[PDB]
Amino acid sequence: DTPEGVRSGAGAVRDAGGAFGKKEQADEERYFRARAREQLAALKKHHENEISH
Amino acid sequence: AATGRIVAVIGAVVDVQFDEGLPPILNALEVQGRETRLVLEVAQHLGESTVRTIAMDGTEGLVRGQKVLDSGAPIKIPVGPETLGRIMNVIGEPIDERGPIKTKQFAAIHAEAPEFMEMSVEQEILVTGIKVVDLLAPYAKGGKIGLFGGAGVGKTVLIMELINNVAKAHGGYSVFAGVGERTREGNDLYHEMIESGVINLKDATSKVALVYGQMNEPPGARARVALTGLTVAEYFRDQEGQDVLLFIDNIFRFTQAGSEVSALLGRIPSAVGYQPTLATDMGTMQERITTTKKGSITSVQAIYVPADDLTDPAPATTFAHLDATTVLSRAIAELGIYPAVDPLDSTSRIMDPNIVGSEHYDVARGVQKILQDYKSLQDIIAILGMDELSEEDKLTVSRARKIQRFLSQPFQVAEVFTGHLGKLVPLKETIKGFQQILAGEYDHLPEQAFYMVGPIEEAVAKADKLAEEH
Amino acid sequence: EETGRVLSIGDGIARVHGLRNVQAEEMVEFSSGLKGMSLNLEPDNVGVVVFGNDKLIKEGDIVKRTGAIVDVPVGEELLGRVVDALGNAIDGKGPIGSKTRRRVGLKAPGIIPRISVREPMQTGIKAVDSLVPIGRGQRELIIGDRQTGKTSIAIDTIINQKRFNDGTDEKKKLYCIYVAIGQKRSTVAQLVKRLTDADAMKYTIVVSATASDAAPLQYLAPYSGCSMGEYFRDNGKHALIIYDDLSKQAVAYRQMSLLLRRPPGREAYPGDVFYLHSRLLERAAKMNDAFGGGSLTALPVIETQAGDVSAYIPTNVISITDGQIFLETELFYKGIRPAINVGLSVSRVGSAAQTRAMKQVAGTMKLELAQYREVAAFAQFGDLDAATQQLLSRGVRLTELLKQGQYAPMAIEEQVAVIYAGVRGYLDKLEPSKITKFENAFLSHVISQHQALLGKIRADGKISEETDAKLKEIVTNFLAGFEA
Numbered sequence A: 001d002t003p004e005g006v007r008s009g010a011g012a013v014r015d016a017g018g019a020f021g022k023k024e025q026a027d028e029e030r031y032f033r034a035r036a037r038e039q040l041a042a043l044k045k046h047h048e049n050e051i052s053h
Numbered sequence B: 001a002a003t004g005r006i007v008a009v010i011g012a013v014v015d016v017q018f019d020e021g022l023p024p025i026l027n028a029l030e031v032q033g034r035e036t037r038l039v040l041e042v043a044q045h046l047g048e049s050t051v052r053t054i055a056m057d058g059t060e061g062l063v064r065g066q067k068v069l070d071s072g073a074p075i076k077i078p079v080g081p082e083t084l085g086r087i088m089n090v091i092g093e094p095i096d097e098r099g100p101i102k103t104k105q106f107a108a109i110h111a112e113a114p115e116f117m118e119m120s121v122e123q124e125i126l127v128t129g130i131k132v133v134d135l136l137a138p139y140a141k142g143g144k145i146g147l148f149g150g151a152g153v154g155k156t157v158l159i160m161e162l163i164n165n166v167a168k169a170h171g172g173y174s175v176f177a178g179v180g181e182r183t184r185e186g187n188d189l190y191h192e193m194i195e196s197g198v199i200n201l202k203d204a205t206s207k208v209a210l211v212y213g214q215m216n217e218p219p220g221a222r223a224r225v226a227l228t229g230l231t232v233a234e235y236f237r238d239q240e241g242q243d244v245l246l247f248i249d250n251i252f253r254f255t256q257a258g259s260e261v262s263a264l265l266g267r268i269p270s271a272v273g274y275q276p277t278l279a280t281d282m283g284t285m286q287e288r289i290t291t292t293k294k295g296s297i298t299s300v301q302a303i304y305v306p307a308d309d310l311t312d313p314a315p316a317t318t319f320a321h322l323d324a325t326t327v328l329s330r331a332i333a334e335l336g337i338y339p340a341v342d343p344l345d346s347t348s349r350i351m352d353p354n355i356v357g358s359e360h361y362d363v364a365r366g367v368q369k370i371l372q373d374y375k376s377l378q379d380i381i382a383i384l385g386m387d388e389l390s391e392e393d394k395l396t397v398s399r400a401r402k403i404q405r406f407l408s409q410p411f412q413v414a415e416v417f418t419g420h421l422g423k424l425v426p427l428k429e430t431i432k433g434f435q436q437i438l439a440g441e442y443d444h445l446p447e448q449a450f451y452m453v454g455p456i457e458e459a460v461a462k463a464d465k466l467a468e469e470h
Numbered sequence C: 001e002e003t004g005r006v007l008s009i010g011d012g013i014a015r016v017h018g019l020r021n022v023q024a025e026e027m028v029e030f031s032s033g034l035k036g037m038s039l040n041l042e043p044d045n046v047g048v049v050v051f052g053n054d055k056l057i058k059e060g061d062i063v064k065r066t067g068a069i070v071d072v073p074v075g076e077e078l079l080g081r082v083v084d085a086l087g088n089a090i091d092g093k094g095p096i097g098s099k100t101r102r103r104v105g106l107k108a109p110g111i112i113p114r115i116s117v118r119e120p121m122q123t124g125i126k127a128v129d130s131l132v133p134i135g136r137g138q139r140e141l142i143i144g145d146r147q148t149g150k151t152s153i154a155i156d157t158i159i160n161q162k163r164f165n166d167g168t169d170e171k172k173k174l175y176c177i178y179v180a181i182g183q184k185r186s187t188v189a190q191l192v193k194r195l196t197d198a199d200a201m202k203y204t205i206v207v208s209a210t211a212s213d214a215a216p217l218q219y220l221a222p223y224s225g226c227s228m229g230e231y232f233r234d235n236g237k238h239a240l241i242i243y244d245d246l247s248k249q250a251v252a253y254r255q256m257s258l259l260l261r262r263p264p265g266r267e268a269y270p271g272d273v274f275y276l277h278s279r280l281l282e283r284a285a286k287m288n289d290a291f292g293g294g295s296l297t298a299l300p301v302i303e304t305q306a307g308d309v310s311a312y313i314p315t316n317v318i319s320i321t322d323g324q325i326f327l328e329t330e331l332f333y334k335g336i337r338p339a340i341n342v343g344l345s346v347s348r349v350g351s352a353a354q355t356r357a358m359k360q361v362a363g364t365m366k367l368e369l370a371q372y373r374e375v376a377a378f379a380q381f382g383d384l385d386a387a388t389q390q391l392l393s394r395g396v397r398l399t400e401l402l403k404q405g406q407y408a409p410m411a412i413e414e415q416v417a418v419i420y421a422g423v424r425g426y427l428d429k430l431e432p433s434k435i436t437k438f439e440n441a442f443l444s445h446v447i448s449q450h451q452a453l454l455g456k457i458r459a460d461g462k463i464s465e466e467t468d469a470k471l472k473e474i475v476t477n478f479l480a481g482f483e484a
């Protein structure tokens, strides 16, 4: 539309630093913190397997 | 020589009346009777044979009527191979307490800019060893590098790391111009280079000259130290056909110092509050710092971004004068990624698939695109939830986070801060690692493994350690 | 005495006619006894800023040159005395016996006279001494909003200095200087009362430029105090100075310059406000051994309206200082008192300006708190005990550990003890609202029974493996016996 109107961009939610940005930040961490644990455990199992063989 | 008398001392702006022939603008005037040396540089011919001059040191003690001589030349500094390993002031006075700087050639700080027919058109690549810089915004040999950043974001640490990695390896001499910086950092750099060997107090093999005007100096002095340093670099470029590295800290201080004296000089304030002669003076300084056909000067300039506002006139104008720009984002530093180079803001002119190579260009653009898509996805995450995104979205987020972590590189100068040993990543290894991460070969590895590592070989090795400690 | 005639006296600015031999920045004496400083030397007149009420000054008064650039009575005879900007005692305890006068506008030490920051400048605050350590010679900014506790932090550091000052070694002794700029007289009196009930006044010089005091006096006060500290710094002694409300000095400079007809700039602050604050803070330095090895530590205070640290003076002062301690109102009213935003608060380590024993626990505390901050910012709990709930519980424990009261500085060894107790996971089982009670009780128990442990920690400066085992025993035993 008219260029003069304020235009939002990707990442604005996190760039604001408000409650919604913090929720997104924490939510990403909680997910991948758990995923890393699963990945790390799988890597440990892989290492044990190659140690056995 | 046409001995003048002080007629007014307001702040750093001192007006002198010359009964005999008026000194031309930019000439240096010496105030007689002072215990130390106070140099007044002519700024304006006010009229009635009176010159408005900006003092290069403190104006305390000046009394109306005090005699002022005319040097007849712009401020001249000792310049030559004998300045290496020596600290000099704006007026070219040894401040290292090591005796007089005995150079057989003296040069004025003010000089004309190199001509258009003297400009070089070559564009090489300088491998600093930093993954973010070499991949996303590769520096160029001879180009003008700019370290944009706010306060406490990593400008000084990054520039010191660049000195450690490049300047030490570089055979040609280097010049450090500490424009409006902390005096403590100046002493730290001086001592560090002494033990590092770049400055040898015993022999004459020193490879770096130091020009320092700290924030303790008056506004006038802080506006010409950059000119003194670049004059020394120009000597190391024209008189001696060698490659030089000019490292200046907080060039912003050059512009800011002018803003502190423009009102007294009598100029109507420009926007925000900077002097009306912002772009002109900044260009006059910057155009001199270039790689002519005679010699090359790879210049790395730290630029303070006031209040982290890149739209501010001082950083905004300097963008056009720099070939390669690396913007340090505070938000990334808050995330912990060090260096805090903004992957989606840093730009380099040599970022051309013809120049850096197709593979390099493709990998860099892919990294930037995946990070943009991650930025887009975060907004969705905030509402939907991470456990609501599609698998493609989750895969993209994971890969982007891995890439962001791998951008972080421990620095040798930051060994004291982080505690991790500094690492230097070759360009080929950087490209290979980021290409592998983009492909997904290391998706099984945790994100933590990619944080504060060197090559991807260190990245995978770290993951194994965590599994052993799991 | 080359003198002049006051052409115009208005709002504290005297355009004296004469004084043809007057020096710039030189003090001049008026007929009434009021003293002024010549700032705007003009071709026909001299702009003098009076250091007091201008009602006594009238047109046609005779202004006599003092003959000296403005200086302040300096020395160790000012310890324990509340002085004004010109070194005149206002405590009513008698004349100050200063034999030396130092110019208020001296240059800062150069590159060579300085050495790397080594000595730790303990504040007595757990959060400051653990996550944002301050070294001697390091300029740390206590930035924050109104009623956030910056003055509390400064006075707590002042009180903390006692345990070293009353000792024997002169290396650890840190004389303090409080410069009150713009604070009301009742507030300054309350500060002095706190210091003299904690017996900290004996090693403090309280330079006071209250609101009643003239704008020139308020502008000069920080430089006066800095010179008084420079006395100790250049004699090998170590000194600390707190420029309370450096922003109030900026408004005094604005008034002085604008009334001197100097054109205004951003927010009407004179363009040289950056230099105004830079030349003051740059003096704070750690002298090298050849220059005596003394140090001067500066803790400027800046008030930020609505927490906008992007404002002109806040950014100017932030750039100058080595590190910044950010105090936020939301933390204060959320219970974190002191309200130090450890995430955003930054402090250059001071080239290992933290004791080894503190470092050992502080590194892990910092990492744990960072991870806790990253993960526990949702308040929308769904279910990951092993990963998140374990981490956030430890974060809550460490935050409760960091919480500290007012006018109760803790010795570094006691901070090491409590931070140890929290960081080793010994308090993870302890109730999050009972952590504070445990902190107080454990502190008392250690100080009384295991005082030898504290002495060993302090003497060694490092917690060895054997001392660690002793601490394990102590904490485990008390924790088991904590709840009867």
Ligand SMILES: Nc1ncnc2c1ncn2[C@@H]1O[C@H](COP(=O)(O)OP(=O)(O)OP(=O)(O)O)[C@@H](O)[C@H]1O
Binding pocket: C145, C146, C147, C148, C149, C150, C151, C152, C153, C337, C338, C404, C405, C406
């Ligand atoms: N550690 C603390 N715990 C709890 N309350 C505290 C603590 N330190 C200070 N306070 C309280 O916080 C309030 C404000 O403290 P303080 O006077 O230091 O603030 P300030 O920012 O310096 O104020 P001002 O704007 O008046 O200069 C006071 O009521 C004080 O008692």
Ligand SMILES: Nc1ncnc2c1ncn2[C@@H]1O[C@H](COP(=O)(O)OP(=O)(O)O)[C@@H](O)[C@H]1O
Binding pocket: B149, B150, B151, B152, B153, B154, B155, B156, B157, B158, B338, B339, B340, B409, B410, B411, B414, B417, B418, C347, C348, C349
């Ligand atoms: N690898 C790193 N790179 C940059 N800064 C780091 C790094 N590790 C820790 N830091 C912290 O970030 C700060 C950056 O501040 P500095 O560069 O000195 O000032 P400025 O950012 O204004 O130039 C450092 O003082 C340091 O404490």
Ligand SMILES: [Mg+2]
Binding pocket: B152, B155, B156, B157
């Ligand atoms: Mg810096």
Ligand SMILES: [Mg+2]
Binding pocket: C150, C151, C152
């Ligand atoms: Mg206060």
